[PDB]
Each structure stands twice: as structure tokens, then as C-alpha cells.
Amino acid sequence: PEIVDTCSLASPASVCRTKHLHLRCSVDFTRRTLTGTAALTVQSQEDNLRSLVLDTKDLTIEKVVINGQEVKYALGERQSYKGSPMEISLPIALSKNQEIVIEISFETSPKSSALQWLTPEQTSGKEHPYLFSQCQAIHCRAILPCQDTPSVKLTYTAEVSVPKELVALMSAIRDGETPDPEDPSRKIYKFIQKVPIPCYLIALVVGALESRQIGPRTLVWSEKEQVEKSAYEFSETESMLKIAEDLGGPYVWGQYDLLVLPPSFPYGGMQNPCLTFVTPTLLAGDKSLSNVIAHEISHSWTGNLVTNKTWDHFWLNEGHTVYLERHICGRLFGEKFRHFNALGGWGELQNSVKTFGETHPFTKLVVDLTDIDPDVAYSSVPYEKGFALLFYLEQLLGGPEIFLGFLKAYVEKFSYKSITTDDWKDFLYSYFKDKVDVLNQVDWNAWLYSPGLPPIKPNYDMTLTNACIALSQRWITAKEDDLNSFNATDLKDLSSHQLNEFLAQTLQRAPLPLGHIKRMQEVYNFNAINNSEIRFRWLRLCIQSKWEDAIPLALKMATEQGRMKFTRPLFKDLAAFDKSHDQAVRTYQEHKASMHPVTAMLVGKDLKVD
Ligand SMILES: [Yb+3]
Ligand SMILES: [Zn+2]
């Protein structure tokens, strides 16, 4: 039973396993480099082990020390996005289970795909620079040498030297700060992560950060101009943690802090232990985009405790998290709301499948990432087709209470481990042994390995969705002489979530006549809404409907923030519209150097530049 991580070039967990990382580095904003030592405590899993391989990507290695002496190592040739393998020759052959510590002196490249360095002008304060990391899926190797596979979990401690006036934070518990003995103009911040974690959860942020407490175990962090708004936006955080604990078991990470990043953060959120990273585009002003916090909170169980063994099994991480996420929202706002969000999710799955094509490999729940950059394959499929499967199993097996019992047992069963889809399925069959006849009715091969929409769509309560579909259909079937019928009162009884779903429904049938779009702005004044999800869909609707007035608005949103979910589709819509094509390409070219490296790369591919 052998499964290898095709995205890693390091020795596999069957050969050796990293148990701990002690990181000592200094952040050099002048050179845009992280410099230090990564001391890995490694345990041999084999007899007579004399060498091992680590993943690296654009790292400059100065030396490798074991037992106080330098040893031979060699960097192989780069393998595109996978980076360069680093083979280290051990001074003494190791016995099985023997542990040694290997200290590697390294320096990162300013072009590290794991990092984004921001000048003072790119921050809210305008006086200090800012640095932030994002390692998922395989960018940790672009920060430090390591076995960059989620099949290996390690604890870590770190000491980070940063300019005196800045603050460093990591996905660990803060363990103090002090002046830097070898440079009085610096501070050394210490950190400790006692719970084993896959390396993609290692995180670092350095900047002029301030904090505010918003719950018994939660501090919100951001630059000063965002603290008050963030504290209010995420005030439901503690109640969500409490519901999540009831669903998945105890929260074992100690603290649950939030860090609101600069606009270029590529994701809505990233589940870094002890410190969730979130996009500032969540600051809608009314806590309406809080499902993203519910999502990152859920990862503290599904993803961080029970982890996908390789990225081919990413749906395990995301499907279960979306499932727990929607239950948190269900508890907080009602079962009908969980169904509304669930049905919306199906809508997003439809969109993804239509975008890649119904036979495209990336629409499969379990994908083969051999030779595929995880960033290119990344989409809503593992999230929504994964959720769809669990939702279908829930309805098949007896309801939410029964399936939630399986999810808690699942987490408990695989805590602190890395598993595959087969491990999950075996446990599902084990847990529901008395309902195998029912389980044996699901078309596993289609659900897990076939492209396109799932072979079966679950049942969804339609209560909250009905008004959205009805208003969307009125607009789609409307002819010119019906436009006068629409009025701002149409939106009277719609929540922001329904307004968003109304636009999502309409966007699925875009383009609409340009005259309908102008009328929509005239009566609903969508241009005034700053809720990013609604503005995002409204602008795509305008652009795909060929409304030139929307060009500057779409360009502005595409560049002023960098959440991939919004930036990529906007640039793509703008490129597809002939009136804006040249300007979209030109705007990308000009912003490219100061964008997040992964986002820059993906928009480059989307627009077919270079
Ligand atoms: Yb008519
Ligand atoms: Zn997630």
C-alpha cells in the first residue's frame, strides 16, 4: 500500500520524518531576504540511512551542519514549480528510529513564491514595510529547506529578528520578545508550536501591527487603521469557536487569533494554526462575510488535525471544512440558511465545471497532481463537489445529527495524522457498517474520480433562494417595455446574502442586454455597494454585458485588492471585453511587479501574457 507525494522532491515519510524545526532567522527588508538557520530534527525510518533529500525553491544554501561539522550536500537541477532537490550526505549512517538534528544555513530569494514584500506605500500606514507568507500548497520550500509534503507533521519553535519598530507573528503561540543582541535596532520575537503540523501551515507576518482583544482566546491583528473595523467585523468569532468545538471536539491549539492582511492577500482566509490570516475584503461593515471565519475556524479540525496526505486529496481538507462551516452558519442562523448556502455552493460548482469544461481533469474530486502546479489546479471543485458529496451522504445516511456524529468520530480517529481518500472511505464504511447497503448505492467511481457535475444532486430546501430566483428570472425574461416595472422596492425584503445570490443567478445567464444593466443600476444603485462579494458579481455582470462605464470600476477593484477569487475573474472578464482588453493587459503589466507572486503568475497565465 504505497502512495507517494508527487508534488515533493524530498525523501518520503517512509524514509525519514522531520519531527521538529527550530527556525532562527532575520528579516532583511533592504534585501527582501529572510536569512537564518533551519535546524531540523529528523528521525530515520530506515536501517543504514546515509543521505536524505529536502525540498528547496530559490533558496541560497550557505552550509549544512551535523554534529558540529559541515557536511556534503548538493542541489539538483530545478524542476519548474517543484523547485530544487537538496540531497544531504549524512556523516554517520543512521539506524531505524534514530534521530539527529541537521542545521541548514540559508537565505531566501526576493522572488520567493511564498512571500510578498510590501513597500511602505503599499501599506495602510505608509511609513513601514510589510512582509507576509502563504505556504499552501507547496511554497514552504521557498522559505526554508524541508520535506514539503503534508504527509509529514512536525512541531516548531522560532526566533525572528526584525526591525525594532515592527512586530513579527507566526502560526504558533507568542513566546516573548527582546532586543537583538547583535543589532540594537532590532527585536527578536520568539514562537512555539507544540502541536505537530504539516509545513504548509508555517506562517510569518512582519509589519506595524497592533492588536485588540475580541474574545477570551482571540486577538485581532492588523495595521492600526483597520483594528476598530476588524474587531467589529469578527465579533462573532468566539461564538463560532464554541459551536465548532461542539461539532468537532476540543480546540487543541490554545489561542485563536485573527490577522487582517493588506489587500493583496491571495485568499479569503488561510488556516494557519493559532493565527488565521484573512483578506481585508471581508470588512463589509455588517459581519455578512463571516462564513469565511467559520471556515478557517473549522480547519482547526478538518485540515489541521486531520490532514490530507498529499494534495491529490485536498478535497478531504476542504469538503469537510465547508461542511462544518455551513453547520456553524446553520446553528447561528437556521437550517434554512444552511440549505441556502449549500444550494449556492452547488451554483458555484456549476460555474467551475462550466469554466474548466465538464470532462476536464481538475473537475474530478480526487485529482492526480503529478506534473501539475497545485496553484493552477486550485478551484472551488474540491470545496463544493466535496461538500456536495458529504451533503448527499448526510441525506442518504439519516440526516445532519447522524452525519455530524460521523464527522466528530472521523476527526477523533484521524487527529494528528495525514490520510487519503481511501482512509476516509474505509472509516466511513466502518462507522456506518449497519448502512453499507445504502453506502453501496452511491456511485463512488463517479463521485471520486469522474469529471463534471456529481452523478446526483442533493435535495435543497428552497425557501430563501426562491425570491432570488424569481427576481433573476424577471430580469432575464424582461423585454424593454418591462424595465419600467423594476423599482428599488424589489430589494426591500432581501438580505445582503440574497442580493448576492440574485446577482449570482443573473450572472449565470450573462450577458444581459446593456439596457437591462443600465436600468438595474438606475433602480438598485448597485454601484454604491461596497460588500466585495456583491460588488464583484455586479461588476462581472456589467463587464460581460459590455457596459463601458463599468471598465474603470472593474479595473479599480481588480487592482486595489488581490483576493484571487475576485482579481482573476475580473481581469479575465476585462480581457474578454474588446473595449477593455488592451487596458486589462496593460494594467496587469504595470502592477505585475508589485503583486503577490502567485497571483501575478496566475493572472499572467489567464491573460496569456509573456
Ligand atoms: Yb412587452
Ligand atoms: Zn478551506
Cα(516)–Cα(483) distance, integer angstroms: 7
Distances (CA, A) of 557 to 301, 312, 498, 553, 605: 34, 33, 22, 6, 19
**What is the Å distance from ligand 1's center to 531 Cα?**
34
Cα(267)–Cα(562) distance, integer angstroms: 8
Cell 456589467 found at: 542
Candidates 104, 71, 97, 85; CA nearest to 149 is 85
Question: Hey, CA dihedral for 423, 424, 429, 430, is it positive or negative?
Answer: positive
Cis (ω within 30 of 0) for the bond into 511? yes
Residue 175 buriedness (CB in 10 A; 0-12 / 13-18 / 19+): middle
**Ligand in closest contact with the CA of 485:** 1
Residue 588 grid cell:
496587469
**What is the Å distance from ligand 1's center to 522 Cα?**
20
Candidates 366, 522, 523; CA nearest to 451 is 366
Distances (CA, A) of 127 to 119, 121, 547: 9, 7, 39
Candidates 127, 154, 133; CA nearest to 43 is 154
3-state SS class at 409? helix
**Helix 335-356 crosses helix 496-507 at what angle (to 10 degrees)?**
30
Q: What's the CATH code of the domain at 237? A: 3.30.2010.30
**What is the Å distance from ligand 2's center to 219 Cα?**
21
**What is the Å distance from ligand 1's center to 516 Cα?**
14
Q: 477 and 390 in one domain?
A: no
**Ligand in closest contact with the CA of 484:** 1
Nearest-10 Cα torsion for 398, 401, 402, 406: 140
449 has which bridge partners? none
Distances (CA, A) of 580 to 39, 133, 252, 546, 555: 51, 33, 50, 10, 9
**Ligand in closest contact with the CA of 384:** 2
3-state SS class at 370? coil
Q: 250 and 345 in one domain?
A: no
6 lies in a domain?
no
| E strands present in 149-287 | 153-163, 167-170, 173-180, 183-198, 204-207, 210-215, 218-222, 257-260, 269-270, 275-278
**Ligand in closest contact with the CA of 314:** 2
Candidates 55, 87, 89, 50; CA nearest to 72 is 89
**What is the Å distance from ligand 2's center to 42 Cα?**
29
- Boundary (domain end) residue, out of 271, 304, 337: 304
Q: 587 and 486 in one domain?
A: yes
348 lies in a domain?
yes
Cα(465)–Cα(461) distance, integer angstroms: 8
**Ligand in closest contact with the CA of 323:** 2
Cα(75)–Cα(84) distance, integer angstroms: 6
7 lies in a domain?
no
- Boundary (domain end) residue, out of 284, 304, 324: 304
CB 223 within 8 A of CB 124: yes
**What is the Å distance from ligand 2's center to 134 Cα?**
13
Q: 322 and 266 in one domain?
A: no
Cα(158)–Cα(507) distance, integer angstroms: 47
Q: 403 and 496 in one domain?
A: no
**What is the Å distance from ligand 1's center to 469 Cα?**
21
| E strands present in 29-182 | 33-44, 49-56, 60-66, 69-70, 73-75, 84-94, 99-107, 115-118, 130-133, 153-163, 167-170, 173-180
Cα(233)–Cα(482) distance, integer angstroms: 39
**What is the Å distance from ligand 1's center to 528 Cα?**
30
Q: What's the CATH code of the domain at 482? A: 1.25.40.320
**What is the Å distance from ligand 2's center to 318 Cα?**
5
Residue 118 grid cell:
510590501
125 lies in a domain?
yes
Residue 575 grid cell:
480581457
Question: Hey, CA dihedral for 287, 288, 294, 296, is it positive or negative?
Answer: negative
CB 444 within 8 A of CB 428: no
Ramachandran area for residue 93 (φ above 0: left; ψ -120 to 50: alpha; else beta): beta
Residue 213 grid cell:
482583544
Residue 560 grid cell:
486595489
> Residue 242 contacts by C-beta under 8 Å, 6 or more apart in sequence?
none
**Residue span of the structural domain in which 185 resides:** 15-207
Q: What's the CATH code of the domain at 454? A: 1.10.390.10
44 lies in a domain?
yes
**Ligand in closest contact with the CA of 481:** 1
State the total domains in the chain: 4
Q: 284 and 199 in one domain?
A: no
Q: Catalytic residue at 296?
A: yes
**What is the Å distance from ligand 1's center to 478 Cα?**
8
**What is the Å distance from ligand 1's center to 485 Cα?**
11
One-letter amino acid for residue 285 of the chain = G
3-state SS class at 47? coil
CB 606 within 8 A of CB 575: yes
Q: 337 and 300 in one domain?
A: no
Q: 101 and 144 in one domain?
A: yes
* Residue 436 half-sphere exposure toward CB, CA atoms < 13 A: 8
The angstrom resolution of this structure is: 2.1
Distances (CA, A) of 283 to 134, 228, 241, 276, 539: 21, 11, 20, 15, 19
**What is the Å distance from ligand 1's center to 523 Cα?**
19
Q: 316 and 168 in one domain?
A: no
3-state SS class at 101? strand
Q: What is the DSSP letter of 435?
A: G
Nearest-10 Cα torsion for 267, 276, 156, 306: -80
Q: What's the CATH code of the domain at 191? A: 2.60.40.1730
8 lies in a domain?
no
511 lies in a domain?
yes
Which entry of 383, 410, 524, 588 is annotated as an active-site residue? 383
1 lies in a domain?
no
**What is the Å distance from ligand 1's center to 482 Cα?**
6
Q: Catalytic residue at 501?
A: no
**What is the Å distance from ligand 1's center to 480 Cα?**
7
Cell 445529527 found at: 401
Q: 27 and 171 in one domain?
A: yes
Candidates 177, 204, 207; CA nearest to 189 is 177
> Residue 322 contacts by C-beta under 8 Å, 6 or more apart in sequence?
295, 345, 383, 384, 386, 387
**Ligand in closest contact with the CA of 479:** 1
CA angle 116, 380, 351 (to 5 degrees): 125
CA angle 299, 302, 308 (to 5 degrees): 110
| Furthest CA-CA distance within the chain | 85
Q: 362 and 252 in one domain?
A: no
Q: 161 and 36 in one domain?
A: yes
**What is the Å distance from ligand 1's center to 473 Cα?**
15
Which entry of 159, 223, 233, 296 is annotated as an active-site residue? 296
Q: In what order do the strands lie in the sheet with 204-207?
A: 115-118, 130-133, 204-207, 167-170
* Residue 384 half-sphere exposure toward CB, CA atoms < 13 A: 23
**Ligand in closest contact with the CA of 387:** 2
Cα(397)–Cα(469) distance, integer angstroms: 30
One-letter amino acid for residue 430 of the chain = S
- Boundary (domain end) residue, out of 207, 242, 266: 207
* Residue 495 half-sphere exposure toward CB, CA atoms < 13 A: 13
